[PDB]
Amino acid sequence: AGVKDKKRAILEATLAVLRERGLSGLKMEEVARRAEVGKGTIYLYFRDKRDLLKALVEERTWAFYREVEEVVRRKAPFFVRLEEVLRRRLAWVQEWRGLWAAVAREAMDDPTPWLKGLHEHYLRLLEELLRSGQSEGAVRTGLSPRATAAVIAAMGCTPSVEAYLEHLMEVLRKGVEP
Amino acid sequence: AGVKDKKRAILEATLAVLRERGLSGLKMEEVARRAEVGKGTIYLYFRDKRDLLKALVEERTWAFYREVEEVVRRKAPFFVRLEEVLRRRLAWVQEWRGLWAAVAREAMDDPTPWLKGLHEHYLRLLEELLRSGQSEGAVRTGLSPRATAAVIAAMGCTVEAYLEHLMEVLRKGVEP
C-alpha cells in the first residue's frame, strides 16, 4: 500500500527516460517499465502524461530552489555563497535550456505566470543573500537589495566556466573602474 | 542599378508582407509585386522563402552592429558609450524575442552555429570598447578585455530603472 514510493519511482523513471530519449522519445511504456508499474497504474497517480511531466518539472524546480536557499542561508562568507549560487544557477540554466523549457511548455498550457513567479522567487533569494552581505560588511549598505538582485539575476543568456566565473566575481565585487 | 540596392528593396518588401500577412501569407509573387521586380528576379536573388528570411535577419543584425560600432568608436567618455551600447542592446533583445528569433529559426535547420557567430561580433565590439576604456583610465588595466567583454555580454541580458543600477554595479561592484 505504498504510494509515496510508487509516485517517486514513476517520477525518477520519467526523468531517466527524458535524459535518455529527450522529451520527443518519451514513451509511458518505458516509464512504466522502468518504474515497475503497469501503464494504467501511472494514470492513478497522474491525470495524464502532461500532468506527470508537470509534476516532474515542478519537483526539479522546487529542488533547485531548495538548494539555492540552503546556500544562501549557510554560515559562509557572502562572496563564497554568491559564487556558489552563480555556479549552480549557470548549471541550472543549461539544464533548463536543454530540457525543462520544452517540458514546461508541453506540461503547462499557461506556464508564463509560473515562470514569472520562479523569477520573483530567485530575486528574493538574491536579495536575502545581499542583505546578509550588507550585515557582514561585504556589500555596501547604500545598495538597494532589490535593484542589485535584478542585476545579478541577469546571467543566463550568453554561452560566454571556472575562468569565466572568476572574472564575473571580480566585476561583481569591484566593478571595472579603477 | 546596383545588386545590393535591389536586394535591399526586396528585403524591405519582404518585411512589409510579413508584418501584414504573416509568413503563412508570404508569397514570392507578393514580394515581387511590392518590390516592383519580376518574379524571376526574386528567385534569382533568393532561391527559396527560407533564404529570404535568412538574409532578412542578417540585414537587421549587421545594421545593429553598425549602430553599436558607431557608439563604440565615438569620441566620448567610456561610461557614456557603455550605457548607450547596453541601452541599444536591450532594445535589440526585445526586438529579437518578438520576431527575429522566430525568423532565424525558420531561416535554417540549425541557427546556433550562425548565431554564435553573431555573439562573436558583439563581443569583439565590447572588447574594443573596454580596451579604449583602459587607455582612457576609466577601466582598470588589470582586467582581461576578452573575459570582461564576456561578462558584460552576459550581465547585459534582460520600466527601465534597470540600466542605471546595472551601470552602478558594472562601474563599482557591490563591495565597500
3-state secondary structure of A51: helix
Q: How far apart are CA B48 and CA A38, in angstroms?
A: 49
Q: How far apart are CA B132 and CA A57, in angstroms?
A: 46
> How many angstroms separate the CA of residue B142 from the nearest CA in chain A?
9
Size of interface A-B (CB pairs under 8 A): 106
Within an 8 Å CB–CB cutoff, is residue B148 touching chain A? yes
The CA-to-CA distance between both ends of chain B, in Å, stands at 62
For A93, what's the count of Cα atoms within 13 Å in the CB-facing half-sphere? 16
Angle A3-25/A28-35 helices, nearest 10 degrees? Answer: 150
Q: How far apart are CA A139 and CA A132, in angstroms?
A: 8
Within an 8 Å CB–CB cutoff, is residue A178 touching chain B? yes
The answer to whether the CB atoms of B158 and A154 lie below 8 A apart is: yes
Q: How far apart are CA B127 and CA B82, in angstroms?
A: 11
Q: Which of A58, A52, A54 is nearest to A7 (CA)?
A: A52
What would the DSSP string read from start to end of A129-143? HHHHHHHHTSS-TTS
Interface-testing mutation among B162, B167, B169, with chain A (most A C-beta atoms within 10 A) = B169
Handedness of CA B132, B141, B170, B176 (dihedral sign): negative
Within an 8 Å CB–CB cutoff, is residue A62 touching chain B? no
- Within a 10 A sphere around the Cβ of A164, how many other Cβ atoms? 15
Q: Which of B112, B96, B99, B114 is nearest to B158 (CA)?
A: B96
Chain B residues with beta carbon closer than 8 angstroms to that of A85: none
**C-alpha distances in Å from residue A50, one per residue of A23, A54, A102, A108, B23:** 11, 6, 12, 7, 30
Domains in chain A with CATH codes: 1-178 (1.10.357.10)
Q: How far apart are CA B122 and CA B128, in angstroms?
A: 10
Q: How far apart are CA B36 and CA B30, in angstroms?
A: 10
Q: How far apart are CA B63 and CA A104, in angstroms?
A: 35
What would the DSSP string read from start to end of A99-156? IIHHHHHHH-SS-HHHHHHHHHHHHHHHHHHHHHHHHHTSS-TTS-HHHHHHHHHT-S
Chain B residues with beta carbon closer than 8 angstroms to that of A178: 137-141
Interface-testing mutation among B80, B172, B175, with chain A (most A C-beta atoms within 10 A) = B175
Chain A residues with beta carbon closer than 8 angstroms to that of B143: 167, 170, 176
Chain B residues with beta carbon closer than 8 angstroms to that of A140: 174-176
Q: Write the DSSP symbol of residue B132.
A: H
Q: How far apart are CA B96 and CA B14, in angstroms?
A: 17
Q: Which of residues 93-132 of A touch B (CB under 8 A)?
A: 130
Q: How far apart are CA A49 and CA A114, in angstroms?
A: 19
Please report which residue ranges of B73-138 form alpha helices under DSSP H.
78-95, 101-107, 112-136
CB-based contact B107:B53 (threshold 8 Å): yes
Chain A residues with beta carbon closer than 8 angstroms to that of B93: 157
Q: Which of A100, A16, A23 is nearest to A57 (CA)?
A: A100
Report the chain B residue with the minimal C-alpha distance to residue A144: B165
Q: What is the resolution of this structure in A?
A: 2.0
Question: What nine digits make up the cell of B149?
Answer: 567583454
Chain A residues with beta carbon closer than 8 angstroms to that of B150: 158, 160, 164, 167
Residue written as grid cell 565597500:
B176
Task: Classify each residue of B44-65 as buried b or exposed e, where b means 16 or more C-beta atoms within 10 Å of its C-beta.
Answer: ebbeebeebbbbbbebbbeebb
